[PDB]
């Protein structure tokens, strides 16, 4: 139920939904502590495949550590 | 001029017109802690505060401790006075310590902001009527007004003598309190008892014989 609700978040061809580049352009804090914030990162994740593979491998490696750590102690 | 060692060279930061006129200058900084003049100003203030509270504390040790060997004032030892006082008191010690932390924090923060700016606590409106008497007296660490009631600071020709008597009695009272602490740990008796033991047999009752201070003998 949580993933089916979460999969209705982004803007496809139906008018409603979040626009990811607008989300990245929004999250820039005042006082310039992150500089320009997350401006211009949508064209560096979507245009690059090694960035996407790095994010994917970071997530999958941490989740594989999670699989081992939770399957030895909580055997299903 | 006068020095803590006749013959040693005076450090260059304690031989300046801003340092020679302070109080009790004898060229004593072998660690070089006062080379920064802002640091020397801060350390002047810390020395004055340690001097004054050390004198008040050591007076509270000695005068009840001397008069208890006379007739009146059955006063316990200073390492036992807090326990007897909290048995006689009305509040537990944590509540009394919290009250004194608020009351001392207000006063100490006043003195803090007067260190950070000399012309600071004389803001009009900031105090009901004590705002005009909470300035300094052109020399920081030496306030006027309600502090110094008897007006002894007004006379200029006695003033370096008053400063130097204060700094000598204060440094000597700091040594007195550190001696109270060490004597308390090594012997276990009161400081007037230590003085009576050094007067009764000087050549046998001292820190070479207590078995603590130098244990290689």
């Amino acid at each position: 139920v949580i993933f089916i609700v979460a999969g209705h978040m982004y803007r496809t061809n139906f008018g409603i939904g979040h626009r990811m580049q607008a989300i990245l352009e929004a999250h820039t804090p005042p006082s310039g502590s992150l500089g320009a914030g997350h401006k211009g990162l949508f064209d560096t994740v979507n245009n690059s495949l090694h960035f996407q593979l790095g994010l994917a491998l970071a997530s999958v490696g941490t989740i594989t550590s999670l699989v081992a750590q939770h399957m030895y102690s909580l055997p299903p | 001029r006068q020095s803590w060692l006749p013959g040693s060279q005076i450090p260059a930061h304690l031989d300046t017109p801003a340092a020679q006129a302070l109080a009790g200058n004898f060229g004593f900084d072998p660690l070089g802690l006062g080379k920064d003049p802002v640091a020397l100003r801060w350390y002047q203030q810390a020395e004055l505060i340690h001097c004054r509270t050390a004198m008040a504390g050591v007076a509270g040790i000695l005068i009840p401790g001397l008069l208890t060997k006379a007739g009146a004032l059955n006063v316990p030892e200073w390492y036992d006075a807090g326990k007897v006082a909290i048995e006689n008191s009305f509040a537990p010690w944590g509540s009394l310590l919290a009250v004194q932390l608020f009351l001392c924090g207000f006063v100490e923060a006043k003195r803090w902001q007067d260190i950070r700016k000399p012309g600071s606590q004389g803001e009009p409106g900031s105090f009901l009527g004590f705002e005009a008497s909470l300035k300094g007296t052109s020399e920081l660490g030496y306030p006027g007004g309600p502090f110094d009631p008897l007006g002894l600071s007004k006379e200029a020709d006695k003033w370096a003598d008053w400063k130097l008597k204060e700094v000598k009695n204060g440094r000597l009272a700091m040594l007195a309190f550190l001696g109270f602490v060490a004597q308390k740990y090594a012997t276990g008796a009161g400081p007037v008892d230590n003085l009576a033991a050094h007067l009764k047999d000087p050549w046998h009752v001292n820190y070479a014989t207590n078995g603590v201070s130098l244990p290689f003998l």
Binding site: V5, H8, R11, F14, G15, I16 | -
Partner: protein, 68 residues
């Protein structure tokens, strides 16, 4: 219990609260294709706010069914 009252009331509440007070904010943040509703409250808006209504209604029914 009364399932129809809870589901219909939650759906009516979320559809009204998206029809009247959260319509203009959702239009400002977003800036099938045409309905004759005077505020542009089209079919997909009905689907989203009714989905939230059914979800909160069945959540209320489940928490009531546990009696906790």
């Amino acid at each position: 219990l009364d399932p129809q009252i809870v589901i219909s009331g939650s759906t009516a509440a979320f559809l009204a609260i998206g029809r009247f007070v959260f319509l203009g904010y959702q239009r400002r943040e977003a800036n099938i294709f045409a309905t004759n509703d005077p505020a542009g409250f089209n079919i997909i808006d009905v689907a989203g706010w009714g989905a939230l209504g059914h979800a909160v209604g069945f959540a209320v029914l489940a928490i009531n069914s546990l009696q906790g």
